[PDB]
Amino acid sequence: MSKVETGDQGYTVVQSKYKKAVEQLQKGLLDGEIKIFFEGTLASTIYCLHKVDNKLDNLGDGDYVDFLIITKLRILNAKEETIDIDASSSKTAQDLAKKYVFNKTDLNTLYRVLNGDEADTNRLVEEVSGKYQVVLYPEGKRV
């Protein structure tokens, strides 16, 4: 289970926001090992950090980088897209479902915390920028 793959409990970062992630890693000093995976292939065990920098710098459409600190972290090459559901001209939950395929289980446990059945001990509902926010990743486009 000590391997980063889809559905694993951990953190996910888009390739555009990787530097701030890996900066909180060097300052960590083991909170006082950082394992780096290139598309599931080994790159570093732990300059080399510049080698990791260049891979994340020239990531492609189907390319991704994984990290392992007790903690798991994946960095992938998806585009950023924020939808404010309180705003008009936004895609409806239907139009979002017609275009994208979503994971049903993640949508379930997200609702349960929101409904109050579970205490938000892992900060899935984050008080940030004055609003309540959640992050959702689809699994592909609907053909």
Partner: protein, 416 residues
């Protein structure tokens, strides 16, 4: 950001959902997960002509990575019938399902190029000038429905070509039925005009079933169909010799299978035929769906009928029913996705462990609701009664021309 499930590599975007109140985005997540389930579990498969629609069925459920597909890997056999020769392969649906094969169509004079390409892809044919004798093609129809040049060109690609043909419609039909086999002492009999009747029974006939009527996709056997001369007093000696010791189910009214024919079958089988027939084809289809031993008692799980199909009827041209021909092998195997090793796999293709994930428990076959322009109320009652408490999970439309009015009414019964 947060400790959650990490995303897929091929994720197209990163959606951040923000709202001033937590109850608003809780409702949006509720709405999203509902319409995500519906859009992912209601699909249409069709093509431009009768040939392409058969091609479309093969592409999606045979040798495809699609989840809920029948076979993840390539196949070895392909069933071929004449284009408008609906009557020269009308009973070929159980053959295609038994042979683990798709049912494709071809013209009479020349082998269509689109068919030629389709045979290569579903069979993983590497070269068209070498030899591919590990692959078989069955020709349903005589020289006047599939001519000699088609079978010669098919052999030019190094393909095995087996022709099932007779001197008329009824003889050729017996060749196809004998190819399927009477491996359960149970058969379906239709008349020379009951083309819509055989389409209603094809999906359950194509079901690979246990001797106990249960589902078995590794050892189960299909049920053949026979079309006879219903406009007569007795039945042909060829029909008598095929239907031996069988519990025959007549599908169709007395205008296509007369009471004289029914009593002749009673006199030729030793058992009273179990007639399933309404006043028209749609009422006959409703009784087929309603039957408990057809789609309910076969299941190995605690749930009831969940998955459903829908195709056209021949109320207008009588040649539309070819789409229900190619759909029947797929609907009879819906529920689980198997690799070339016969093991149940997930979306990514990894095998499923644990006795809970038995492929005979995960499978749930689907009837074909025969409806071109309207849905009979008798069908609606059957679909509702056979549905499980937790509701349905799949609906597949086959072919072009089915009214959406039938489609969304189905979605209400299945509650998708």
């Amino acid at each position: 950001a947060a400790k959650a499930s990490i995303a897929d590599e091929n994720s197209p975007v990163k959606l951040t959902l923000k709202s001033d109140k937590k109850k608003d985005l809780k409702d949006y997540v509720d709405d999203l997960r509902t319409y995500n389930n519906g859009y992912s579990n209601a699909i249409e498969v069709a093509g431009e002509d009768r040939i392409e629609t058969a091609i479309a069925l093969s592409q999606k459920y045979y040798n495809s990575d699609d989840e809920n597909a029948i076979f993840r890997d390539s196949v070895d056999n392909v069933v071929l019938v004449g284009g408008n020769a609906i009557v020269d392969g009308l009973v070929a649906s159980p053959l295609a399902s038994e042979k683990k094969a798709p049912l494709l169509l071809t013209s009479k004079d020349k082998l269509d190029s689109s068919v030629k390409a389709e045979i290569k892809r579903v069979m993983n044919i590497k070269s068209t000038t070498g030899i591919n004798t590990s692959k078989k093609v069955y020709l349903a129809g005589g020289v006047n429905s599939i001519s000699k040049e088609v079978e010669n060109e098919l052999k030019d690609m190094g393909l095995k070509v087996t022709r099932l043909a007779g001197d008329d419609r009824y003889e050729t039909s017996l060749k196809i039925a004998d190819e399927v086999g009477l491996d359960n002492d149970k058969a379906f009999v239709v008349g020379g005009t009951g083309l819509a009747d055989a389409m209603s029974i094809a999906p359950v006939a194509s079901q690979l079933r246990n001797a106990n009527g249960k589902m078995d996709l590794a050892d189960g056997d299909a049920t053949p169909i026979v079309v006879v001369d219903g406009k007569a007093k007795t039945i042909n000696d060829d029909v008598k010799d095929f239907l031996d010791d069988s519990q025959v189910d007549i599908i169709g009214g007395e205008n296509s299978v007369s009471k004289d024919v029914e009593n002749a079958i009673d006199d030729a089988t030793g058992k009273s035929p179990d007639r399933y027939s309404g006043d028209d084809r749609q009422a006959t289809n409703a009784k087929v769906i309603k039957e408990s031993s057809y789609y309910q008692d076969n299941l190995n799980n605690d749930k009831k009928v969940v998955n459903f199909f829908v195709a056209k009827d021949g109320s207008t041209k009588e040649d539309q029913l070819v789409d229900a021909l190619a759909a029947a092998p797929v609907a009879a195997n819906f529920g689980v996705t198997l690799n070339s090793d016969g093991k149940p796999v997930d979306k990514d293709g990894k095998v499923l462990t644990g006795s809970d994930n038995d492929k005979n428990k995960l499978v749930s076959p689907a009837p074909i609701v025969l409806a071109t322009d309207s849905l009979s109320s008798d069908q609606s009652v059957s679909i509702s009664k056979v549905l499980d408490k937790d509701n349905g999970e799949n609906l597949v439309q086959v072919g072009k021309g089915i009214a959406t009015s039938v489609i969304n009414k189905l979605k209400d019964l299945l509650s998708m």
